[PDB]
Amino acid sequence: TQIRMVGTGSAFSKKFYNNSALVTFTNGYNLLIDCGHSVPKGLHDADIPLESIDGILITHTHADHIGGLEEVALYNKFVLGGRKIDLLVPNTLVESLWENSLKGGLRYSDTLSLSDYFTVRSLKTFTSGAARTQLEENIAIKLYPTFHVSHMASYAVGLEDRGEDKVFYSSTIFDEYLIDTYSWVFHDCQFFTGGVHASLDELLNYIPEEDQDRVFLMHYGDNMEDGRMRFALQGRTY
Amino acid sequence: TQIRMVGTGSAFSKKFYNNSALVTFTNGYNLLIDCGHSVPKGLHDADIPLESIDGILITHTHADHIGGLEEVALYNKFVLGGRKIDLLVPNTLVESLWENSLKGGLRYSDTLSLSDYFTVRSLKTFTSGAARTQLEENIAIKLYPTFHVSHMASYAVGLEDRGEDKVFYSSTIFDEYLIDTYSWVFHDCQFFTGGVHASLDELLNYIPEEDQDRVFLMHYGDNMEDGRMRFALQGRTY
Ligand SMILES: [Zn+2]
Ligand SMILES: [Zn+2]
Ligand SMILES: [Zn+2]
Ligand SMILES: [Zn+2]
C-alpha cells in the first residue's frame, strides 16, 4: 500500500497540479482521489497510463476536483471501448455532480446520465460523524464530512487496506476536532489566515505533541519557497 | 494591432494551454478572448502580468473558456483593490454564465452577482447573421453565431481597429458559409472527422482558391507532430 501525490497545488496554483492522490492498494487496486482539470495532465506527467485506473473518489463538486471527469469518460468510452470503471461518490454529492457541475451532460457526447460513463458507487454519509463503506475484499473507506465553503458539502476520506488504517486524506478548513487514530495524515495547508482553507499557522497552533512525524501538508499556494511536518512532494512515491 | 496566442490546444490537450487570444490594439487596449482553467497559467508563462488586462471576451460557457474567470475575479478584487474590468459577453450567454457555469457564485468569495466582479458589457447578438457592437473610440467587434454543440450557443468574433478589419477569430464546427472579407482568419482545427470541431480535412476540402495565405489553424489535438495554411504557434507574437 503506497500513495503517489499526482498534484499538490491549490486551485489557483501554476507550478503544481490540482491536489489529487494516486493510491494503489495491496490487491492491485489503483484509486485516484479527486480529478480536476489539470489532473489528467498530472497523470500524463507521472507516466502512469490512464488504462490502469480502477476507481475515482470525489470529495468536491468544484472545478479543481471534477474538471477532468469529462475527459476520463471521454477516454474510457471512446478509446477503451466503454470500460465503465468505479466513480466513488458520496451520496449527497451525486445529484449535485451530474445535474449541476457537469451541465447535466457532457459536451462531446451530448444527450444520458452518469450511469452511462461510470459505475456510480454511492458512498454512505451523514453529518454528525464518520461513515464506513466497503468496496472490494480488503478496500474500506471512512468518510468524514469536512467544512469547506458554506452551503456546500466536502468530505475527508480514510483508507483501510485489509483491516489496517493506512492513510487519512483531508482533501477543508482548520477543523478543531481531528482524529489523528491513523497511521499517516495528509492535510490541506494554506499560507494565509482565513478563507476556506486550513492555514499553516493554525497547524502550528495545534502541534506541541510530537505527532508531527505523521502529518503531511498539501493543497497550498504557489509561492512555495520553504515545523517537523514535511510537505507532500509532487512526484514522490510512498 | 498585434495578436498573441496564449494557448493553442483543444479542451483535452496537455502540451498546449486552452486556446485563448491576447489582442493588443493601437490605443493600448489589451483584450483576452476566452479564459479557461489553464489560461491564467498561459499568461504567467508568457510573462504578461494580469494587471495589464483591460477586457475579456467570452465565446463559450464551457470549462475550457470560463475556467479561469473565477481566478481573474480573485486577482482583481483581492490583490488589485477591486479593479472592475471589462467582461465582453454576448447577451444570450449572460444568464447562462453566472447562474449555471459559475455555480451561481464563486467559491472563495461566496454570497452577489456578476456585476460585482466585472463591468458586464452585454454584446448584441442574433441567429440569422452577424452583429456589430462598439466598445471604445476605435474598438469594434463583430459577432457571428457559430454552431458547436446542440442546444448551446457559441460565437465567432471579428475585430476592427479604427475602421479596418484586422482579424477574424472563430473560437466551432466546419461552417460551410464563411466570410473570409477579413485580413486574417484564425480557425478551429481538428484532427478527426466528426464531433463538434472543424477538422483539417474539411478545411482542405475548401482550399483550392489560394486564400490559404490568410488562414491560421488553432484549437487542435495534442498529437501535433506536423497545406499552405500555417498553424498558430504558441508564444509567437503577431
Ligand atoms: Zn482540494
Ligand atoms: Zn476544496
Ligand atoms: Zn475553444
Ligand atoms: Zn468550443
Tell whether B62 lies on the interface with A, counting CB pairs under 8 A: yes
* Residue A31 to residue A186: CA distance in whole angstroms: 16
Between the two ends of chain B, the Cα-to-Cα distance in Å is 8
Query: B149 vs A103: CB contact, 8 Å cut-off?
Result: no
Instruction: Look at residues B6, B2, B42, B41 and name the one whose alpha carbon lies nearest to residue B23.
Output: B2
Element (H, E) at B69: helix B69-74
Instruction: Look at residues A66, A71, A72, A75 and name the one whose alpha carbon lies nearest to residue A94.
Output: A66
* Residue B67 to residue B54: CA distance in whole angstroms: 18
User: Is the four-CA dihedral A25, A29, A34, A40 of positive or negative sign?
Assistant: positive
Catalytic residue among A70, A144, A202, A220: A70
* Residue B17 to residue A235: CA distance in whole angstroms: 21
**Binding site membership of A for Zn(2+): which residues?**
60, 62, 64-65, 148, 219
Catalytic residue among A95, A108, A164, A206: A108
* Residue A32 to residue B51: CA distance in whole angstroms: 36
Nearest 5°: phi and psi at B34?
Answer: 70, 140
Q: Mutation test of the interface with chain A: which of B6, B10, B14, choosing the one with the most A Cβ atoms within 10 A?
A: B14
DSSP A155-179: EEEEEEETTEEEEEE------SS--
Gaps after which residues in chain B, C–N over 2.5 Å?
Answer: 111, 171, 180, 226
A166 with A198: CB under 8 angstroms?
no
Centre a 10 Å sphere on the Cβ of residue A135 and count the other Cβ atoms it contains. Answer: 18
Counting Cβ atoms within 10 Å, is residue B25 exposed (0-12), middle (13-18) or buried (19+)? buried
B214 with B183: CB under 8 angstroms?
yes
Helices (H), strands (E): how many in chain B? 5, 13
> Cα(A85) to centroid of ligand 2, in Å?
24
Catalytic residue among B51, B95, B99, B108: B108
Sheet hosting strand A131-134, strand order edge to edge = A131-134, A139-146, A154-161, A164-169, A184-188, A215-218, A230-231
User: Is the four-CA dihedral A42, A47, A50, A55 of positive or negative sign?
Assistant: negative
* Residue B149 to residue A106: CA distance in whole angstroms: 10
Q: What is the resolution of this structure in A?
A: 2.7
* Residue A187 to residue A147: CA distance in whole angstroms: 13
User: DSSP secondary-structure letter at B233?
Assistant: P
B33 Cβ neighbours under 8 A, 6+ residues apart: B20, B21, B22, B23, B56, B57, B59, B157, B169, B171
Q: State the method.
A: X-ray
Residues of A204-228 as b/e, b for ≥16 C-beta within 10 angstroms? eeeeeeeeeebbbbbbbbeeeeeee
Instruction: Look at residues A58, A47, A51 and name the one whose alpha carbon lies nearest to residue A21.
Output: A58
Counting Cβ atoms within 10 Å, is residue A175 exposed (0-12), middle (13-18) or buried (19+)? middle
A171 with A64: CB under 8 angstroms?
no
* Residue B76 to residue B84: CA distance in whole angstroms: 7
Instruction: Provide the residues around ligand 4 (an ion) whose CB is within 5 A.
Output: B 148
Residue B206 catalytic?
no
* Residue B8 to residue A30: CA distance in whole angstroms: 32
Three cell numbers written together for A167: 492513510
**Domains in chain B, CATH or no CATH each:** 2-237 (3.60.15.10)
Residue A155 catalytic?
no
